């Protein structure tokens, strides 16, 4: 995460190492944890947490990629295998349905595993408590990648409401607000929340706030992709005006 010059500072650091040498005790455990917990603001702790989060993120991305490769290979192998008992069309339809079931189950399993890895990475990055080090470009890049991967996996597992806080955190990193897929995901998730409030006869304030959020983010996604004063933008304005 961070790569770890004044003569006075060098002298201070030398005297600190000299002090630490006198009180060398590998078996020391601080009864009061506050001074030890000050290490969470150090560079070494930040680098270790960054590396742990990176390892978890690579594990999740690898899981997704291996699932895609496995699905491609399974389709190819099933296509290249001889079927000497298959002579009707409905048998081929049934075989295709069975293959689709297998592929779907494998995809969901892999998505669940990758989401576990992404959640572990999120937790690892969460415990970096230095505001200065959280502003580094590398931290922002890794955080955006982890948030994006978690959002897509969670959406694929049909857990739409859980994506909203992560998407809102995402659109505040750098210029991530300018990306239209984030707003498309937000519009879908807010639509799900509004439909849930509608079907459960929940409070009207919740319904109105969810509908307003969905309309705002749908309009923003339409503007970001097709541009202002476009046929798509005019159509979306018409839909929003009719809905509200």
């Amino acid at each position: 995460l961070v790569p770890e010059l004044t003569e006075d500072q060098k002298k201070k650091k030398k005297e600190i190492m000299e002090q630490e040498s006198l009180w060398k005790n590998p078996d020391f455990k601080g009864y009061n944890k506050t001074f030890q917990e000050l290490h969470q603001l150090s560079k070494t702790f930040a680098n270790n947490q960054f590396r742990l989060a990176l390892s978890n993120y690579q594990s999740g991305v690898n899981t997704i990629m291996k699932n895609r490769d496995w699905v491609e290979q399974y389709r190819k192998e099933e296509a290249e295998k001889k079927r000497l008992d298959e002579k009707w069309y409905w048998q081929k339809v049934d075989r295709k349905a069975r293959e689709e079931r297998v592929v779907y189950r494998e995809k969901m399993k892999a998505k669940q595993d990758a989401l576990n890895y992404f959640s572990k990475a999120i937790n690892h990055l969460d415990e970096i408590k230095n505001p200065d080090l959280r502003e580094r470009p590398e931290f922002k890049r890794l955080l955006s990648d982890v948030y994006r991967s978690w959002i897509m996996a969670e959406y694929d597992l049909q857990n739409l409401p859980q994506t909203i806080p992560i998407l809102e955190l995402y659109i505040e990193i750098d210029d991530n607000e300018k990306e239209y897929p984030a707003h498309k995901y937000l519009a879908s998730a807010y639509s799900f929340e509004e439909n849930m409030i509608k079907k459960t006869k929940g409070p009207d304030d919740m319904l109105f706030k969810y509908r307003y959020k969905k309309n705002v983010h749908l309009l923003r996604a339409t503007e970001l992709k097709y541009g202002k004063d476009s046929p798509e933008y005019k159509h979306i304005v018409n839909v929003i005006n009719r809905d509200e």
């Binding site: 989401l115 576990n116 959640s119 572990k120």
Partner: protein, 281 residues
Amino acid sequence: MIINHNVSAIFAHRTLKSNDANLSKDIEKLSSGMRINKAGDDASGLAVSEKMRTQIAGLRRAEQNTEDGMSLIQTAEGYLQETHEIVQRVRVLAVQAANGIYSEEDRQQIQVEVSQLVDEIDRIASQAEFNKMKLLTGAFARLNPTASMWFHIGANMHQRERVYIETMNTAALGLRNPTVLTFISLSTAGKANSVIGLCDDALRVISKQRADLGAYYNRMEHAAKGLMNAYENTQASESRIRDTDMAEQMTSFTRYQILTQAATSMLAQANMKSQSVMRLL
């Protein structure tokens, strides 16, 4: 004859003193019921007897420790009985929910009970206790423990055995994600089908844990019986060394009592002896 001193009287008194001391020692053995009452009687016998007395007091205490240990193990296996019946109930609900004749509302009504049963599993795990000590949370597990449970089942320094109890909540049973904290759902026929396999694994983990505790319990029963056997043998050994035989000791008391009377009579005779020559003046 000599009158200034009486040699016969000195001999009779000297014998009387020895007999009287021996009489006191016989009284002490008869009044207390112990063959050795002072270190001067038999030093090695007193040493071995007191060591066996430490062993005897230890063997009852060690036996009492073993019964208390069996109470803990029995208490733990009582809690797991309720966990097993809840997972069996969830397992039979999953079979019903997997049938295709049901709609979304019926499956949600099944999930309503599922949520309560999962919460009851978690409550059992959290609140199971022996003497204000939690048992099913994982503190005594083999991997990453926060505590160790040792039963001291002997009368000496290092005679202790270890017992492990593993985590028995929903996360440990495979019924809840330990990172996301979401648990099983029967609200869909496809998910209900997957739960049938998950319940089987959970029942397998509970069944293995009950078999472990049953093994610990059976072992402590064998040790408790041996501890009772060892105490009986040690007390027999200590009794033979330390306790006096009343019948044999009463014979010794009567011999010395008669000896004291005979010497007393002779002392009286010796004192009158010198008066014989007084008639010569």
